[PDB]
Amino acid sequence: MPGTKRFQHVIETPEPGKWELSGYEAAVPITEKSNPLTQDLDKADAENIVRLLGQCDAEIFQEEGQSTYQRLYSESILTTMVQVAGKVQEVLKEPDGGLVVLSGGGTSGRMAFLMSVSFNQLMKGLGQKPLYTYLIAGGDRSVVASREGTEDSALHGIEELKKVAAGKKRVIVIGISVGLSAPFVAGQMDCCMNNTAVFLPVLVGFNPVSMARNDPIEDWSSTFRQVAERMQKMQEKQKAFVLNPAIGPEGLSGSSRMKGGSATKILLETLLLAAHKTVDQGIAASQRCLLEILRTFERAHQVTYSQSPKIATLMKSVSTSLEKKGHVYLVGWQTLGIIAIMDGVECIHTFGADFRDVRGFLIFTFSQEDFLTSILPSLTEIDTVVFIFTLDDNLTEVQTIVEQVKEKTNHIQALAHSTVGQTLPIPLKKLFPSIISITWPLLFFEYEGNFIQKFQRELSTKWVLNTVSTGAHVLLGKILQNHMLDLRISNSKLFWRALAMLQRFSGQSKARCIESLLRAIHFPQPLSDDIRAAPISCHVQVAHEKEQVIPIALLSLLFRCSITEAQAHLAAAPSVCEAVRSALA
Numbered sequence: 163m164p165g166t167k168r169f170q171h172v173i174e175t176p177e178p179g180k181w182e183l184s185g186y187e188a189a190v191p192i193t194e195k196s197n198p199l200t201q202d203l204d205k206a207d208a209e210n211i212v213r214l215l216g217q218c219d220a221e222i223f224q225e226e227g228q229s230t231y232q233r234l235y236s237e238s239i240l241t242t243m244v245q246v247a248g249k250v251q252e253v254l255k256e257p258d259g260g261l262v263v264l265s266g267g268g269t270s271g272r273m274a275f276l277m278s279v280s281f282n283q284l285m286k287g288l289g290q291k292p293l294y295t296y297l298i299a300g301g302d303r304s305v306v307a308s309r310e311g312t313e314d315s316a317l318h319g320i321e322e323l324k325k326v327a328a329g330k331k332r333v334i335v336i337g338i339s340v341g342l343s344a345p346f347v348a349g350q351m352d353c354c355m356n357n358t359a360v361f362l363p364v365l366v367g368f369n370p371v372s373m374a375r376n377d378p379i380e381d382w383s384s385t386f387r388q389v390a391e392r393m394q395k396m397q398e399k400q401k402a403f404v405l406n407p408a409i410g411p412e413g414l415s416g417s418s419r420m421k422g423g424s425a426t427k428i429l430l431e432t433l434l435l436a437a438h439k440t441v442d443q444g445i446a447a448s449q450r451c452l453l454e455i456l457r458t459f460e461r462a463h464q465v466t467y468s469q470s471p472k473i474a475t476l477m478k479s480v481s482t483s484l485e486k487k488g489h490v491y492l493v494g495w496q497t498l499g500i501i502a503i504m505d506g507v508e509c510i511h512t513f514g515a516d517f518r519d520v521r522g523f524l525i526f527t528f529s530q531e532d533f534l535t536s537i538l539p540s541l542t543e544i545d546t547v548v549f550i551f552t553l554d555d556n557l558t559e560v561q562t563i564v565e566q567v568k569e570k571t572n573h574i575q576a577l578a579h580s581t582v583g584q585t586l587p588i589p590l591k592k593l594f595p596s597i598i599s600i601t602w603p604l605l606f607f608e609y610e611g612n613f614i615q616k617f618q619r620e621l622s623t624k625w626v627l628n629t630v631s632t633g634a635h636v637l638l639g640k641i642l643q644n645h646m647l648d649l650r651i652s653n654s655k656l657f658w659r660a661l662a663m664l665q666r667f668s669g670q671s672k673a674r675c676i677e678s679l680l681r682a683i684h685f686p687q688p689l690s691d692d693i694r695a696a697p698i699s700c701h702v703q704v705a706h707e708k709e710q711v712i713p714i715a716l717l718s719l720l721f722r723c724s725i726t727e728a729q730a731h732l733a734a735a736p737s738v739c740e741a742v743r744s745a746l747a
């Protein structure tokens with residue numbers, strides 16, 4: 163039948179009560195699962211939200227129970243991290259013709275970028291040629307933009323990989339896809355396995371390979387699952403690797419920018435730092451060297467979330483400023499500035515939020531006076547401005563901007579990272595009455611930019627901003643249980659996630675859910691056979707431009723009404739969320 167090719171793989175909606183027993187729940191990839199910790203996130207207050215996401219984040223470091231999926235601290239995974247460290251060493255020994263590519267779409271792409279900078283710094287600080295580079299779905303502009311549509315082409319990913327791998331002789335490609343999902347990465351990994359004399363593929367993600375994405379890619383014959391399965395078979399001969407610990411579901415279902423992006427740093431910084439810091443000691447990388455770093459990253463979670471009450475309070479002030487109709491500014495220096503930008507941009511697709519809503523700023527890259535002349539004018543009594551810096555930064559360039567922002571604002575708070583026994587100049591740095599001082603132990607660093615201190619701080623800021631940005635929006639009522647219902651379908655994965663959210667919330671068949679979705683997308687056109695049979699990219703291109711696609715589709719289903727009837731209903735309701743929630747009642 164028309165459409166059967168495209169929707170065949172979709173699992174049927176189970177009867178009420180048999181979601182487990184149908185085996186439906188066991189085929190939801192971990193990365194898409196509803197986190198049971200966060201069943202009631204939409205009812206939690208700011209302090210609970212901070213507690214619940216701190217807990218969700220902590221699952222990255224939880225160990226394997228006694229029939230179950232490997233985790234970060236399991237022997238299989240640490241052994242894989244060691245062997246990969248190994249192969250990275252081979253390349254560092256022979257820098258002529260060597261390269262190390264870190265590649266990903268969206269937030270994996272963003273994380274790849276940071277890491278490639280950091281490790282390129284490390285080799286410069288030592289007077290070696292930089293061997294690292296990144297690749298991101300949609301070219302370099304994607305690092306700092308919302309561009310969710312660019313991950314769906316495998317030919318594109320292969321193309322970018324051909325550019326950068328030039329006339330190199332030995333290339334390590336670290337394909338990062340949290341969901342073992344992105345067609346961008348799938349093609350790179352497959353290309354690598356076709357030329358193993360040159361390429362070494364290393365796939366990173368957080369699902370077991372049996373849960374790796376398995377629906378057809380438009381411009382490629384194999385699926386992510388097949389690719390990953392074959393890489394795993396190559397791992398026995400040490401010519402591909404899959405690094406895939408389970409880290410438990412996201413506190414917001416499928417929001418892999420959060421735990422996923424965190425775990426990607428933890429995992430890859432750990433393993434590359436080990437490889438570097440042990441080549442020059444003329445010593446193989448070992449589980450013990452990795453563990454030191456992992457445990458440090460795990461302290462960093464504890465350290466970070468010990469500031470929870472203040473994290474909640476910043477959340478309440480980001481949420482207030484948006485409940486009214488103001489903006490939120492994230493102002494930071496070096497790498498922490500970048501991360502601020504990344505958090506703000508992600509809010510666009512993640513929450514349906516305007517680029518002004520939560521904007522990041524590096525001292526997007528506007529200098530000291532430039533910020534004071536350009537941006538400072540537009541600030542307002544109800545806004546919120548967040549300063550994010552270390553004490554090693556240049557605190558004259560900092561205090562100035564706060565002195566000034568104070569006049570027009572008052573809702574300021576800050577995020578200051580410090581070694582123990584550094585002191586915050588101006589005892590009236592109040593200015594910031596009740597800062598978020600994150601104060602780090604003295605650790606034993608030996609490379610000269612103190613890279614482990616950088617990684618701690620990056621990660622800790624990520625956790626704070628993510629929890630803040632995400633929390634603020636949940637308080638505003640935009641999240642249904644722990645799902646973002648009203649998302650914008652801008653790629654195939656998101657189209658599938660809409661469909662799943664329809665099955666779950668309505669309890670109705672896959673055929674009806676698909677019909678309602680496609681009707682909602684293509685309204686005012688009716689469902690023809692061509693539309694039914696169209697590749698998923700055609701539905702994405704049309705949905706991408708609309709508003710409220712998913713809630714209109716769910717209302718059509720709940721009320722068993724037309725798209726004309728459900729648009730009328732929505733428009734007659736005080737708000738999308740009330741329309742949906744009361745229709746669910």
Ligand SMILES: CC#C[C@H]1CN(S(=O)(=O)c2ccc(N)nc2)CCN1c1ccc([C@](O)(CO)C(F)(F)F)cc1
Pocket residue numbers: 172173190191193194195196341342343369373374375376377415416654655656658659661662663666667
């Ligand atoms: C239809 C469908 C579906 C699945 C899979 N799709 S997907 O893009 O095909 C995909 C993505 C990643 C992966 N590893 N495998 C497949 C991503 C969305 N997804 C999904 C399934 C169920 C659910 C929920 O049922 C929604 O209620 C759950 F509760 F589990 F969150 C959420 C997402």
Ligand SMILES: O=P(O)(O)OC[C@@H](O)[C@@H](O)[C@H](O)[C@@H](O)CO
Pocket residue numbers: 266267268269270310313338339340341342343344416417418419420508511512
């Ligand atoms: O790394 P994945 O699973 O391939 O996902 C890649 C991107 O889709 C993902 O990072 C997305 O942009 C974020 O909005 C997720 O919160």
